[PDB]
C-alpha cells in the first residue's frame, strides 16, 4: 500500500500513483474529446488513426507506474519491460510517420516553385557569372565572391557533397534553390509592406509572389502597393487587371502573364508543372521494438529480485532505450524541418517544441537513471513527464481550440 509508505515517511510511491492517475484522466479526457468532435476541421485535417496510437502510447506510459509500483508478481516484471519499451515506441513511431509525411508534402511544395522559376527565369547546370560578375550556378545561386574560379568549385563541392567539377544536375540545382527560396522568405517576412500579403495568400499564390521578388526585388514588389492590397483582400480578378497595366507587364509580358494568371486561379495552370500506408509503417516500427523486447525476454528471463524490484540488467534497458532514441531523433529531424508549416492551425510548431523538450528529457535520463540509487521512482517520474509533455504540447492546444474557441475552427 502506497499510503503506508507515505505514513512511514516516504512520499515517492504515493506521488507517482497520483501523477499517473491525473495523467490517465487527462488522456481519457482528450481522447473522448477527439471522439465526439471527430468531424471538426481541427481533428479531421490531421490523422485520426495515428492519434489513437499516440494517445494509446501515452496511456500505457502512465500505466507503467502501476508495474513499477505493484504487488510482487512475476508477470509484472514482464509488464514493466514491455511497457517502458513499447509505450514510447507507439507514440514516437506513429509521430515520425506524421512528421515524415508533413516533410514529404513540404518537399513537394518546394518542388513546384522550383519548376516555376526554371521556366520563368532559367537554369544553368555549369558555373557562370551574373551581371555583377560574381560566380554563379543554377537559378542565380551565388557560390562565392572571389575572382578565383577555383573558389566557386570548392564552395560548390562543399555545397553538393561530391566532386562536381563545376557541373551539377537538376536535382542538385534544386537543392541550392531551396536555400535561396528560404532566404527570400526571410526577407519578405522582414519587409513590412510584403509581410501581411504573404501571410494571407495560400500555398500556390505565395510562389507567385516570390517569383516577382526574384525578378524585381523586395523593394520593387513593394511598388505594387495597390495591387498587393487587392491580393490580400482576396480580390484576384481586380489584382490581375491592375497588374496588367504595370510597366512590369509591358516590359516582360510572356513571364508576367503567367505569374498574374497564378494569382487569379491560385493554381499551376499557367505552367506545365497515403493514410493506410502510414498505418502499416507505424505498425512495423512498433514491431521492431517488440522484437527487441521479446528477444531480451529470451536472452535475459525477467525475475523478481510496494516497490517491485526486477532483475532487469542494463542491456535489458539500454537496447530498447537506444531504439526509441532513433525514433525521437528521426521525429525531431523532420519536425524541425517542418517547424514553420502553418497547416492545421500551426500544428507543426507544437510538434517541434515537444520533440525539443523530449530530446532534452531523454538525454538527461541516461546519466540520472544509471547513476541513481532510486531508479524505480526516477523511472516513474521520467516516464510520466515524457508522456505528459507529449500530451500537454500537442493535444491540449487542439483540445483548447475545440472547446473554448468554436468559431475559429
Ligand atoms: N528506458 C527508458 C525510458 C526513458 C524515458 Cl525518459 C521515458 F520517458 C520512458 C517512457 C516513456 C513513455 N512514454 C509514453 C508516451 C510518451 N512517453 N512511456 C514509458 N516509458 C522510458
Ligand atoms: C482528480 C483526483 C484523482 C486523482 C487521484 C486520487 C486517487 C489516489 C488513489 C491513491 C490510493 C492508493 C492506495 O489505496 O493505497
Ligand atoms: C482512484 C485511483 C486509484 C489508484 C489505485 C491504485 C493504487 C495501488 C496500485 C499499485 C499497488 O498495488 O500498490
Ligand atoms: C503485450 C503482449 C506482447 C508480447 C507478449 C509476448 C512476450 C513473450 C516473450 C517470451 C518470454 C520468454 O521466452 O520467457
Ligand atoms: C535526443 C536523443 C534521443 C534520446 C537519447 C537516447 C538514449 C539512449 C542511447 C544511448 C544511451 C547510452 C548507453 C547507456 C549508458 C550505459 C550506462 C551504464 O550502464 O553504466
Ligand closest to CA 71:
3
Task: Say if ligand 4 is within 6 A of residue 220 CB.
Answer: no
Which phi and psi (to 5°) does residue 267 adopt? -125, 180
Q: Which of 130, 199, 237, 303 is catalytic?
A: 130
Question: Which ligand 3 atom sits nearest the alpha carbon of residue 17?
Answer: 7
Alpha-carbon gap, residue 397 to 409, rounded angstroms: 13
- What length does the chain have? 409
Q: What residue has cell string 531523433? A: 329
Q: In what order do the strands lie in the sheet with 135-137?
A: 128-129, 135-137, 141-142
Ligand closest to CA 79:
4
Task: Say if ligand 1 is within 6 A of residue 365 CB.
Answer: yes
Which phi and psi (to 5°) does residue 166 adopt? 75, 15
Alpha-carbon gap, residue 255 to 147, rounded angstroms: 32
The answer to whether 148 is annotated as binding is no
Q: Compute CA 330 distance to the chain's CA centroid, rounded to the nearest angstrom.
A: 10
- Options 3.40.50.11440, 1.10.530.40, 1.10.3720.10, 3.30.70.370; CATH for 107-265 is 1.10.530.40
Task: Say if ligand 2 is within 6 A of residue 28 CB.
Answer: no
Task: Say if ligand 5 is within 6 A of residue 351 CB.
Answer: no
**CB within 8 Å of 252: residues ≥ 6 apart:** 215
Ligand closest to CA 322:
5
Alpha-carbon gap, residue 327 to 365, rounded angstroms: 16
How far does residue 319's CA lie from ligand 2's centre (Å)? 34
Question: What does the block give as the cell for 13?
Answer: 510511491
Alpha-carbon gap, residue 340 to 202, rounded angstroms: 14
166: left (phi over 0), alpha (psi -120 to 50) or beta: left
The answer to whether 242 is annotated as binding is yes
Range 291-308 burial, b when 16+ CB lie within 10 A, else e: ebbeebeeeeebeeebeb
**CB within 8 Å of 27: residues ≥ 6 apart:** 55, 58, 59, 62, 391
How far does residue 322's CA lie from ligand 5's centre (Å)? 6
- Mutate which of 320, 382, 394, 395 for ligand 1 pocket (most atoms within 8 A of beta carbon): 382
Question: What does the block give as the cell for 236?
Answer: 484576384
Q: Please say whether the beta carbons of 198 and 189 come within 8 A.
A: yes
Q: Please say whether the beta carbons of 314 and 327 come within 8 A.
A: no
Alpha-carbon gap, residue 60 to 386, rounded angstroms: 12
Task: Say if ligand 2 is within 6 A of residue 18 CB.
Answer: yes
How far does residue 62's CA lie from ligand 2's centre (Å)? 14
Task: Give the closest residue (by CA) to ligand 5 atom 9.
Answer: 322
- Among 124, 105, 122, smallest CA distance to 114 is for 122
Question: Which ligand 2 atom sits nearest the alpha carbon of residue 2?
Answer: 15
- Mutate which of 88, 89, 359, 366 for ligand 5 pocket (most atoms within 8 A of beta carbon): 366
**CB within 8 Å of 366: residues ≥ 6 apart:** 321
Question: What does the block give as the cell for 146?
Answer: 572571389
How far does residue 307's CA lie from ligand 1's centre (Å)? 19
Q: Please say whether the beta carbons of 156 and 127 come within 8 A.
A: yes
Q: Which of 115, 120, 121, 180 is catalytic?
A: 121
The answer to whether 200 is annotated as binding is no
Is 148 exposed, middle or buried, given 0-12, 13-18 or 19+ CB atoms closer than 10 A? exposed
Q: Are strands 141-142 and 128-129 parallel, antiparallel or unpaired?
A: unpaired
How far does residue 293's CA lie from ligand 4's centre (Å)? 8
Alpha-carbon gap, residue 69 to 5, rounded angstroms: 12
| Catalytic annotation present for 130 | yes
**CB within 8 Å of 277: residues ≥ 6 apart:** none
Question: Which ligand 4 atom sits nearest the alpha carbon of residue 82?
Answer: 1
Ligand closest to CA 62:
1
Task: Say if ligand 3 is within 6 A of residue 20 CB.
Answer: no
Task: Give the closest residue (by CA) to ligand 5 atom 13.
Answer: 318
Q: Compute CA 364 distance to the chain's CA centroid, rounded to the nearest angstrom.
A: 22
Q: Please say whether the beta carbons of 169 and 155 come within 8 A.
A: no
Alpha-carbon gap, residue 331 to 101, rounded angstroms: 11
Q: At what angle are helices 48-63 and 277-299 packed, to 10 degrees?
A: 20
Which phi and psi (to 5°) does residue 175 adopt? -60, -50
Q: Are strands 135-137 and 128-129 parallel, antiparallel or unpaired?
A: antiparallel
3-state SS, one letter per residue, for the chain: CHHHHHHHCCCHHHHHHHHHHHHHHHHHHHHHHHHHCCCCHHHHCCCHHHHHHHHHHHHHHHHHHHCCECCCCCHHHHHHHHHHHHHHHHHHHHHHHHHHHHHHHHHHHHHHHHHHHHHHCCCCCECEECCCCCEEECCCEECCCCCCHHHHHHHHHHHHCCCCCCECCHHHHHHHHHHHHHHHHHHHHCCCCCHHHHHHCCHHHHHHHHHHHHHHCHHHHCCCHHHHHHHHCCCHHHHHHHHCCCHHHHHCHHHHHHHHHHHHHCCCCCCCCCCCHHHHHHHHHHHHHHHHHHHHHHHCCCCECCECCECCCCHHHHHHHHHHHHHHHHHHHHHHHCCCCCHHHHHHHHHHHHHHHHHHHHHHHHHHHCCCCCHHHHHHHHHHHHHHHHHHHHCHHHHHHHHHCCCCC
Half-sphere exposure of 191 (CA within 13 A, CB side): 21
| Catalytic annotation present for 238 | no
Task: Say if ligand 3 is within 6 A of residue 380 CB.
Answer: no
How far does residue 17's CA lie from ligand 3's centre (Å)? 7
Amino acid at each position: 500500500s502506497p499510503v503506508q509508505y507515505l505514513r512511514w515517511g516516504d512520499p515517492a510511491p504515493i506521488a507517482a500513483v497520483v501523477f499517473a492517475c491525473l495523467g490517465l484522466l487527462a488522456t481519457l479526457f482528450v481522447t473522448v474529446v477527439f471522439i465526439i468532435y471527430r468531424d471538426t476541421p481541427v481533428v479531421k485535417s490531421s490523422s485520426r488513426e495515428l492519434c489513437y496510437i499516440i494517445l494509446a502510447g501515452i496511456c500505457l506510459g502512465y500505466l507503467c507506474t502501476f508495474c513499477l509500483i505493484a504487488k510482487p508478481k512475476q508477470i509484472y516484471c514482464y509488464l514493466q519491460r514491455i511497457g517502458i519499451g513499447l509505450s514510447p515506441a507507439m507514440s514516437y513511431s506513429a509521430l515520425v510517420t506524421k512528421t515524415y509525411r508533413a516533410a514529404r508534402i513540404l518537399a513537394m511544395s518546394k518542388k513546384n516553385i522550383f519548376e516555376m522559376l526554371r521556366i520563368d527565369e532559367g537554369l544553368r547546370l555549369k558555373i557562370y557569372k551574373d551581371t555583377e560578375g560574381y560566380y554563379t550556378i543554377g537559378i542565380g545561386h551565388l557560390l562565392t565572391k572571389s575572382p578565383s574560379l577555383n573558389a566557386a568549385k570548392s564552395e560548390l563541392d562543399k555545397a553538393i557533397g561530391r566532386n562536381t567539377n563545376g557541373v551539377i544536375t537538376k536535382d542538385e540545382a534544386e537543392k541550392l534553390f531551396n536555400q535561396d527560396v528560404d532566404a527570400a522568405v526571410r526577407g519578405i517576412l522582414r519587409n513590412a509592406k510584403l509581410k501581411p500579403v504573404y501571410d494571407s495568400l495560400d500555398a500556390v499564390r505565395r510562389a507567385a509572389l516570390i517569383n516577382m521578388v526574384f525578378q524585381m526585388g523586395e523593394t520593387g514588389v513593394a511598388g505594387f502597393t495597390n495591387s498587393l492590397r487587392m491580393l490580400q483582400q482576396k480580390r484576384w480578378d481586380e489584382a490581375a487587371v491592375n497588374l496588367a497595366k504595370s510597366r512590369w507587364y509591358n516590359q516582360t509580358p510572356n513571364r508576367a502573364k503567367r505569374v498574374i494568371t497564378t494569382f487569379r486561379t491560385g493554381t499551376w495552370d499557367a505552367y506545365k508543372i497515403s493514410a493506410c500506408a502510414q498505418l502499416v509503417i507505424a505498425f512495423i516500427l512498433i514491431c521492431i521494438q517488440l522484437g527487441i523486447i521479446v528477444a531480451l525476454f529470451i536472452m535475459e528471463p525477467p525475475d523478481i529480485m510496494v516497490y517491485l524490484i526486477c532483475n532487469t540488467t542494463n542491456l535489458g534497458v539500454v537496447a530498447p532505450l537506444g531504439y526509441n532514441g532513433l525514433l525521437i531523433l528521426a521525429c525531431t529531424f523532420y519536425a524541425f524541418k517542418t517547424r514553420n508549416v502553418p497547416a492545421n492551425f500551426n500544428e507543426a510548431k507544437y510538434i517541434a517544441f515537444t520533440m525539443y523538450t523530449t530530446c532534452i528529457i531523454w538525454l538527461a535520463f541516461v546519466p540520472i537513471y544509471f547513476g541513481s540509487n532510486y531508479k524505480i521512482i526516477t523511472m516513474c517520474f521520467s516516464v510520466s513527464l515524457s508522456a505528459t509533455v507529449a500530451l500537454g504540447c500537442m493535444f491540449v492546444p487542439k483540445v483548447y481550440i475545440i472547446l473554448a474557441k468554436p468559431e475559429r475552427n
